[PDB]
Design a protein around this motif. Sequence first.
Motif, mmCIF file in Angstrom:
data_model
loop_
_atom_site.group_PDB
_atom_site.id
_atom_site.type_symbol
_atom_site.label_atom_id
_atom_site.label_comp_id
_atom_site.label_asym_id
_atom_site.label_seq_id
_atom_site.Cartn_x
_atom_site.Cartn_y
_atom_site.Cartn_z
ATOM 1 N N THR A 154 0.818 -1.208 0.000
ATOM 2 C CA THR A 154 0.000 0.000 0.000
ATOM 3 C C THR A 154 0.857 1.266 0.000
ATOM 4 O OG1 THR A 154 -1.953 -0.979 1.074
ATOM 5 C CG2 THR A 154 -1.613 1.390 1.351
ATOM 6 N N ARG A 155 1.855 1.298 0.877
ATOM 7 C CA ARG A 155 2.686 2.485 1.059
ATOM 8 C C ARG A 155 3.789 2.665 0.019
ATOM 9 N NH1 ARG A 155 2.883 5.398 5.628
ATOM 10 N NH2 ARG A 155 5.138 5.716 5.370
ATOM 11 N N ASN A 156 4.426 1.569 -0.382
ATOM 12 C CA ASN A 156 5.638 1.664 -1.188
ATOM 13 C C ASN A 156 5.477 1.188 -2.626
ATOM 14 O OD1 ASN A 156 6.915 0.640 1.857
ATOM 15 N ND2 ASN A 156 7.524 2.614 0.973
ATOM 16 N N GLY A 157 4.324 0.606 -2.936
ATOM 17 C CA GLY A 157 4.088 0.073 -4.263
ATOM 18 C C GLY A 157 3.709 1.125 -5.286
ATOM 19 N N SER A 158 4.137 0.911 -6.526
ATOM 20 C CA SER A 158 3.711 1.749 -7.638
ATOM 21 C C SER A 158 2.232 1.474 -7.899
ATOM 22 C CB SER A 158 4.559 1.468 -8.883
ATOM 23 O OG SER A 158 4.370 0.142 -9.339
ATOM 24 N N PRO A 159 1.537 2.398 -8.588
ATOM 25 C CA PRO A 159 0.115 2.193 -8.893
ATOM 26 C C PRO A 159 -0.182 0.850 -9.561
ATOM 27 C CG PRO A 159 0.718 4.432 -9.401
ATOM 28 C CD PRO A 159 1.993 3.741 -8.996
ATOM 29 N N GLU A 160 0.697 0.407 -10.454
ATOM 30 C CA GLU A 160 0.521 -0.879 -11.124
ATOM 31 C C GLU A 160 0.706 -2.060 -10.170
ATOM 32 O OE1 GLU A 160 1.847 1.572 -13.057
ATOM 33 O OE2 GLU A 160 3.991 1.658 -12.591
ATOM 34 N N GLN A 161 1.680 -1.961 -9.269
ATOM 35 C CA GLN A 161 1.949 -3.041 -8.321
ATOM 36 C C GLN A 161 0.791 -3.236 -7.348
ATOM 37 O OE1 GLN A 161 5.648 -1.693 -6.643
ATOM 38 N NE2 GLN A 161 6.907 -2.963 -8.003
ATOM 39 N N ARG A 162 0.190 -2.133 -6.915
ATOM 40 C CA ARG A 162 -0.950 -2.199 -6.010
ATOM 41 C C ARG A 162 -2.163 -2.789 -6.721
ATOM 42 N NH1 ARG A 162 0.994 3.218 -4.574
ATOM 43 N NH2 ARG A 162 -0.699 4.104 -5.845
ATOM 44 N N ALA A 163 -2.393 -2.349 -7.953
ATOM 45 C CA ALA A 163 -3.521 -2.829 -8.744
ATOM 46 C C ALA A 163 -3.413 -4.326 -9.030
ATOM 47 C CB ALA A 163 -3.622 -2.050 -10.049
ATOM 48 N N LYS A 164 -2.186 -4.836 -9.067
ATOM 49 C CA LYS A 164 -1.952 -6.242 -9.379
ATOM 50 C C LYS A 164 -2.044 -7.153 -8.155
ATOM 51 C CE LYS A 164 1.432 -9.451 -11.348
ATOM 52 N NZ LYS A 164 2.806 -9.594 -11.905
ATOM 53 N N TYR A 165 -1.467 -6.717 -7.038
ATOM 54 C CA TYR A 165 -1.278 -7.604 -5.892
ATOM 55 C C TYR A 165 -2.271 -7.402 -4.747
ATOM 56 C CZ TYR A 165 3.146 -8.987 -8.014
ATOM 57 O OH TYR A 165 4.106 -9.481 -8.867
ATOM 58 N N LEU A 166 -2.681 -6.161 -4.508
ATOM 59 C CA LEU A 166 -3.567 -5.866 -3.380
ATOM 60 C C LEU A 166 -4.964 -6.512 -3.451
ATOM 61 C CD1 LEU A 166 -2.741 -2.183 -2.373
ATOM 62 C CD2 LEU A 166 -2.059 -4.346 -1.313
ATOM 63 N N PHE A 177 16.239 -18.946 -1.480
ATOM 64 C CA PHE A 177 16.402 -18.393 -2.819
ATOM 65 C C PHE A 177 17.625 -18.985 -3.515
ATOM 66 C CE2 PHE A 177 14.329 -15.113 -0.229
ATOM 67 C CZ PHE A 177 13.171 -14.914 -0.954
ATOM 68 N N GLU A 178 17.386 -19.735 -4.588
ATOM 69 C CA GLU A 178 18.466 -20.315 -5.379
ATOM 70 C C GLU A 178 18.336 -19.922 -6.849
ATOM 71 N N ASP A 179 19.116 -18.924 -7.260
ATOM 72 C CA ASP A 179 19.039 -18.354 -8.605
ATOM 73 C C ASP A 179 17.608 -17.953 -8.958
ATOM 74 N N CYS A 180 16.944 -17.282 -8.021
ATOM 75 C CA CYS A 180 15.554 -16.878 -8.198
ATOM 76 C C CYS A 180 15.434 -15.653 -9.100
ATOM 77 C CB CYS A 180 14.899 -16.599 -6.843
ATOM 78 S SG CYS A 180 13.158 -16.119 -6.951
ATOM 79 N N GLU A 181 14.706 -15.805 -10.201
ATOM 80 C CA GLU A 181 14.551 -14.729 -11.173
ATOM 81 C C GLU A 181 13.402 -13.793 -10.810
ATOM 82 N N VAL A 182 13.734 -12.533 -10.549
ATOM 83 C CA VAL A 182 12.734 -11.525 -10.218
ATOM 84 C C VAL A 182 12.748 -10.397 -11.245
ATOM 85 C CG1 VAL A 182 11.838 -9.983 -8.441
ATOM 86 C CG2 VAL A 182 13.098 -12.047 -7.786
ATOM 87 N N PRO A 183 11.585 -10.116 -11.854
ATOM 88 C CA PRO A 183 11.465 -9.035 -12.839
ATOM 89 C C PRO A 183 11.790 -7.671 -12.239
ATOM 90 C CG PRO A 183 9.544 -10.479 -12.901
ATOM 91 C CD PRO A 183 10.323 -10.855 -11.682
ATOM 92 N N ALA A 184 12.291 -6.755 -13.062
ATOM 93 C CA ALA A 184 12.608 -5.404 -12.607
ATOM 94 C C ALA A 184 11.342 -4.661 -12.197
ATOM 95 C CB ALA A 184 13.346 -4.637 -13.691
ATOM 96 N N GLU A 185 10.216 -5.073 -12.773
ATOM 97 C CA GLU A 185 8.921 -4.479 -12.465
ATOM 98 C C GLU A 185 8.451 -4.833 -11.055
ATOM 99 N N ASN A 186 9.156 -5.758 -10.410
ATOM 100 C CA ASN A 186 8.804 -6.180 -9.059
ATOM 101 C C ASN A 186 9.686 -5.530 -7.999
ATOM 102 O OD1 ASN A 186 7.413 -8.331 -10.711
ATOM 103 N ND2 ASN A 186 6.914 -9.073 -8.651
ATOM 104 N N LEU A 187 10.549 -4.613 -8.422
ATOM 105 C CA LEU A 187 11.325 -3.822 -7.476
ATOM 106 C C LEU A 187 10.385 -2.891 -6.718
ATOM 107 C CD1 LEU A 187 14.065 -2.688 -6.325
ATOM 108 C CD2 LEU A 187 13.976 -1.055 -8.218
ATOM 109 N N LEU A 188 10.452 -2.938 -5.392
ATOM 110 C CA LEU A 188 9.594 -2.108 -4.559
ATOM 111 C C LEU A 188 10.291 -0.795 -4.221
ATOM 112 C CD1 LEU A 188 6.738 -2.364 -3.411
ATOM 113 C CD2 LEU A 188 7.768 -3.026 -1.231
ATOM 114 N N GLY A 189 9.557 0.306 -4.371
ATOM 115 C CA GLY A 189 10.107 1.646 -4.254
ATOM 116 C C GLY A 189 11.422 1.854 -4.985
ATOM 117 N N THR A 190 12.209 2.821 -4.528
ATOM 118 C CA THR A 190 13.434 3.191 -5.225
ATOM 119 C C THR A 190 14.592 2.268 -4.865
#
Lengths: 358, 342, 350, 362
Positions: free
Chosen positions: B102-114, B187-200
């Motif tokens: 809620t606090r740190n997510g981009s508008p798209e991240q909130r719309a997707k996960y919340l 976590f073993e070579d876990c692939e995380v998209p750049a779009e999943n970076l939270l805040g700055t």
Amino acid sequence: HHHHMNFGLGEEIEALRDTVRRFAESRIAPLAAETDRNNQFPMHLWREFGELGVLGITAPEDYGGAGMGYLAHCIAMEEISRASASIGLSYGAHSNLCVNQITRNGSPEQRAKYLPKLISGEHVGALAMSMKLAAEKRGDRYVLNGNKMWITNGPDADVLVVYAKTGISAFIIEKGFKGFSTAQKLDKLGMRGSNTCELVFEDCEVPAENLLGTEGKGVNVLMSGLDYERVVLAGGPLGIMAACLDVVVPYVHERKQFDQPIGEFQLMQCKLADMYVTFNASRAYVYAVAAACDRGETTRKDAAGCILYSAENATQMALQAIQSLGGNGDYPTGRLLRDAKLYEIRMLIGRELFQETR
Amino acid sequence: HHHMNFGLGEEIEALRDTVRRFAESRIAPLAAETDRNNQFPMHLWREFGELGVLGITAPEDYGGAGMGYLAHCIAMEEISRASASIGLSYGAHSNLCVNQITRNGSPEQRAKYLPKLISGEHVGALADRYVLNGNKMWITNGPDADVLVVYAKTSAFIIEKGFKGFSTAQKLDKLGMRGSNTCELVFEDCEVPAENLLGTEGKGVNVLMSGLDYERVVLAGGPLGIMAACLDVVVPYVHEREFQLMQCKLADMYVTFNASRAYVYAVAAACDRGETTRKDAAGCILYSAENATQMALQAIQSLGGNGYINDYPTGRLLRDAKLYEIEIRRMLIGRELFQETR
Amino acid sequence: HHHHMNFGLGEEIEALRDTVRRFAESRIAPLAAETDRNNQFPMHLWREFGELGVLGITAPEDYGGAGMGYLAHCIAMEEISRASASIGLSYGAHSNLCVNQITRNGSPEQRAKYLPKLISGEHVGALAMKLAAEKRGDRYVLNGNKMWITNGPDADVLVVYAKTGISAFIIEKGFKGFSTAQKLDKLGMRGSNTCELVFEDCEVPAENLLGLDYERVVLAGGPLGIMAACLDVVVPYVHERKQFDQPGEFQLMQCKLADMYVTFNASRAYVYAVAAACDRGETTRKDAAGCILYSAENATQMALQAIQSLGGNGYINDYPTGRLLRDAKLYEIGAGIRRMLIGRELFQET
Amino acid sequence: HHHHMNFGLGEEIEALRDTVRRFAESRIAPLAAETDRNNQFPMHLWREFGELGVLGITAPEDYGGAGMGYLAHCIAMEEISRASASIGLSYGAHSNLCVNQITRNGSPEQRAKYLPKLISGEHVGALAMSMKLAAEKRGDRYVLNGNKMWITNGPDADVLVVYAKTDISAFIIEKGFKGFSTAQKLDKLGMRGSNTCELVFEDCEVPAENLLGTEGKGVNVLMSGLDYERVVLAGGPLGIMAACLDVVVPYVHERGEFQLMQCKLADMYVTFNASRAYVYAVAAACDRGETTRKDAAGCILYSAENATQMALQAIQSLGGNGYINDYPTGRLLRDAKLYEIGAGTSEIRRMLIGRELFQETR
Ligand SMILES: [Ca+2]
């Protein structure tokens, strides 16, 4: 000073707190030590309190009062006690025990007659609740005989609210009444400079117009204010705890040095944390109960609860302050402990809780 | 009748009653079984969602209630009152995970996960592409979490359960808070998209620190609920079993309970005013947690022999209370007070 | 009084306790209030202590000592402090800090010279544990100062430590270069004469060169005595308060009594045990510090509780509950950071 | 381990301590966690206790006892409880509550009949103090009806010392007595593996030869043992505190935070040895024959409360690990709490002391 949590009590109460604090710092704190040593209240403070506008916090504005509540009064009590617990106690007995009793239970005529001078500070007030005193109706007048011990502002009080057995009634006594006298003031371990003495009544003639509320209905008059008034006096322990932090926090700063023992700084910080938490937890509890009083809600178990809790916390915090300063403790910490003990001097809470849940 | 009224307003008083009635009917009967089986009853997630309590501090635009931390704390309190284990799991979801997004997510991240987190369809937890390797221990709701907020060195990340390289170890066998599923994240070579970076990027410390305060304040409702539960048991028992010493014991429980509530509520209210401060957040959870444990001991004491039997819940209350206590809080407060008063 | 548990300490120690107790009751307690008020040690007590035979408890019998141990001395300290903590402190500094240091670390010539008059009470002793000493042939030259010294203004013989790395010396009042400042007016321990020692080119003979934990344990008798005094006040009061109109207050008062009783006797048990360990020659560094810290803090809380139990009566500056608090506080200050030393010892040993 | 102060108790007591400690370390400590998990006493220990010679510490050597005192027994209790509090409690109920009662109040025939097998460990003993149980004389026999709750070693006891009402009298009960039965054992918060259950008497026939001491003077038998019981069983809290230090001290080694840990360690050390000093002193007084009603209650009250609070601190010191069932800190807390409840609550103990103190100073 940054050891006060903000409770968002509104601009008016925060202005009151700040006003009383500046007054206490300049007019009370410098004479705190001398007051304790000489065992004498500085009488010039009564008129200054009046002009500050704090002697009638919960009194109607028609008599010069502020027309505020018990939360506001508790905090005024707190900031005054912070500078001097003795003076805080005398202030509480006057502005809360006496004035608010007349405010709540006095007839319109009684309020108009006695309150203005009490609120201005030209008159000093006292309350004698706790039977050692008996009153007897004799036609137009009442005749009082007996005694009352341990009365704050006793030697100086011009107006006194007194309870006597008739089964119980309350009376307004003037210093000039024939048959009324006061014994030598007490030499106490703490709260020195808060003048405390015995009241003596020998065939004291009291007019029928000076009867407070209904005759035989004095216990409900006692019970009326006692819950609300007792909460305001919890400001005493709160103020003492504030005074403890006033001493310890700058001391920890002065002591933080390279030559300081390897671990004493981290232990000092932990001691600070406990003091900080205990202080603000007590404030939270007392303020909440005070606010409940202002809402007109019954607070019998919690009123007694917050006084008990805060009084004991103040005593232990004063001891922790002494412990923390070690050898170096010149400092007022000794006085704080001695003062705290009087407020400390449970079954009522438990009994009522048990009976309510039957 | 051991609850003092704090005059918190009509909406909060309505929320408390709503949560209380749900807890009594849908949580309390399963409290004992949850502790015994060391398993969270998964059906509660959708029920919490339909109750509308999984997004108390979340915007109404994502299905949240749009309320504050005081309200959330009290919801936490009433739930924990029925079951401390379930309360802990609830807190990790609705506050640790959801409020962070809620606090740190981009508008798209909130719309997707919340939306799915607030509905209870997804479970939450707190611990061109990014590659995360390493592990995180002691994560509440770990084995069941569909969405996880994770901190790593580069920063905060949003992790999905289906991500390759992400796995969970065997859940812990704890003294208390049993049925609050806690496990190791791997976590073993876990692939995380750049779009999943939270805040700055590089500003993860401010994200972590931000939530910690709100967590300490909202989760302080846990100890509050446990203390409430202590009184829920002891008060009727002393009647069924007047003595002078017991009344004093009752008084101490009553006073400690409402003093704890007063402190926690005030700090929570301070957060809602935006007057949030680290030491008071840390202060009220430290205070309430220690009080809860000691009261649980007193609750056991009051019931005597029966209090020491696994049939009665007093044993569980003690075991549950201890986790909230699990130096760092006192040193944080002292250091913070010191630097402000320099 | 029935708030003392019996520890079966043997006929000799029990005789010492009884003798000191009877003396304290008749000769110390009546002047306790006046001693605190006037801030003056009653000097006549030194000779009376001497004739009583308690100034050399741990001193050899060949010099007039009792030839007893630290357990015995702790208990003498306790019973005296029970009547007056101030007088107890002065007694402890003399008979324990000064005399036992000369007893343990003094040469045969030094013992024969200084102990007899100290044990008789004709001489008053002190210990001073910022000061430098420099060897210059036949003599030592001391310069510097020592603060907060008990029996300072009255001391005829003083055991003093100085920096060279550290050495101890026997100082006489008549030594050139040695002087004492105005005695302190302290918040508590009033009537225990305390002052600054001043050394300005103080000439000390080489024959006066000398050679703490065991001695520190004996002083734990102070807090023990203070706690005993607390019960001496509270127990009779609870009887007086037991009345026809009373009150749920009686039962709660008895519970308060139980806690005081247990705290008192648990403290005694711990301190006595450490004292007995000292007599056996067993290392007690963490336990010495432990029992001094423990008993001192217990004394302060019990003094506060004594004030609590007496209520209004307890809160008048006339009554001795005020004095007990002031006295107890000084022992807790002097025994303090202390805990970190103990923990460090346990950690490094393991 | 260097967190034990030496009390100079003499070669014989020090020899006993070392013997029990080495046994506890090898035969008890490894089974502590499993005992708690299974909620079952390891029955093989009774015979092992017997051959060790610790089941009859205060029993005469004529029946196989050690002929030692309550100070020695307290320390045996301590070292055993140090390894396992549950097993310590069961051991205490057997060797002290049951055996010492028969030793003190039994006739020569009763001692010759019941003590040897109890001391050898072939029989398990229990004591049933708490009325709810009534006995009626019927010529040669007694007929008992009622129940007794919360009896340690209840399910396994071959010999039980039981108190009953006559209008109070004490009796020696055998498991095989007609009318005597036991209910399902308790599922407790702590002291798991210390088998506790209800005793049930339905027209239980007891021979007149099994009456303990004088009929109608059972309160004196009960009060007598309670004092000695409180002192020996005080070894329980002492052992638990010892166990706390056994865990915490090595753990801090493996792990400004360090300075706070040392202060916490110091408090644990001081509390532990102060408790020992007090308990040992009261025990020694018992051996001197010096009645100490308030001090008996005093030392168990003191040590029991100290043990529980120390257990909380032990859990705290280990952090996350302290909250894991693998580590023993969780169990220590659960175990310690019973002593505050058991043998009379802390409330009854404080009032007993205060009441006794008040009447002596009347
Ligand atoms: Ca000799």
